[PDB]
Every structure is written in C-alpha cells, then in structure tokens.
Amino acid sequence: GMGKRDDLIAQYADDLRNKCGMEPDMALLEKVTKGCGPAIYNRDASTVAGSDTAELETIKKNFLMKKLGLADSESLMGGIQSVIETYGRSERNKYRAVVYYMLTKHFGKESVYG
Numbered sequence: 001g002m003g004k005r006d007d008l009i010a011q012y013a014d015d016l017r018n019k020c021g022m023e024p025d026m027a028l029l030e031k032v033t034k035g036c037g038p039a040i041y042n043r044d045a046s047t048v049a050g051s052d053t054a055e056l057e058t059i060k061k062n063f064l065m066k067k068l069g070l071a072d073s074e075s076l077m078g079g080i081q082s083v084i085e086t087y088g089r090s091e092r093n094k095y096r097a098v099v100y101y102m103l104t105k106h107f108g109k110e111s112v113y114g
C-alpha cells in the first residue's frame with residue numbers, strides 16, 4: 001500500500017472535493033497536515049467532534065487565536081460553525097486537518113503556513 005500518511009492526505013483531499021465542494025490546494029493541505037502531527041493510525045484521534053462545545057472552544061483558543069493569530073470575536077465561532085456545517089451534519093469522521101484547512105481558507109490565513 002501507499003502508507004498511512006499518503007492515505008490520510010488522499011482522504012483529506014477527497015473529503016474537500018467531494019464532501020465540502022472545494023478544489024483542494026494540495027501545497028496548503030500538506031502544510032496543515034504537518035502541523036497536525038505525524039500520520040495517525042487511530043481514526044478516533046484524527047477527527048473532531050463537531051457537536052462538542054468544549055472541542056470547538058479549544059479550536060477557537062488553540063488554533064484560531066493561538067496559531068492563526070486571530071482576535072477574540074463572534075466571527076471565530078461563526079467561522080467554526082460554518083466549516084462544520086459545510087463538512088456536514090451527517091459526517092461522523094470530520095478530520096481535524098480538513099477542519100483546520102477550511103478555517104485557514106475561511107479566514108484568509110494561508111500565508112501563516114509559509
């Protein structure tokens with residue numbers, strides 16, 4: 001096989017195109033994936049619970065505010081809610097790399113990844 005790291009990035013790209021309706025920027029997606037960590041074999045650890053308030057508050061504080069450098073405002077949770085809705089209410093495997101990629105796009109923060 002191709003190995004878990006490639007399988008994951010391929011899956012993220014497929015989700016972006018075929019679930020979220022977006023043309024994936026592969027160069028950015030790779031940078032976002034690097035930031036999430038080494039390839040994860042345990043599916044549970046690579047996904048975001050869209051319906052968990054604390055998990056969304058953590059994405060706001062640790063990713064949007066701490067990493068992307070965005071200020072505290074209604075637009076942050078609004079953006080999180082938007083990307084979770086885009087990924088889909090019926091999706092039980094919302095990959096955290098895909099969510100981070102979508103938020104980076106949504107807020108125009110691509111250049112922070114280099």
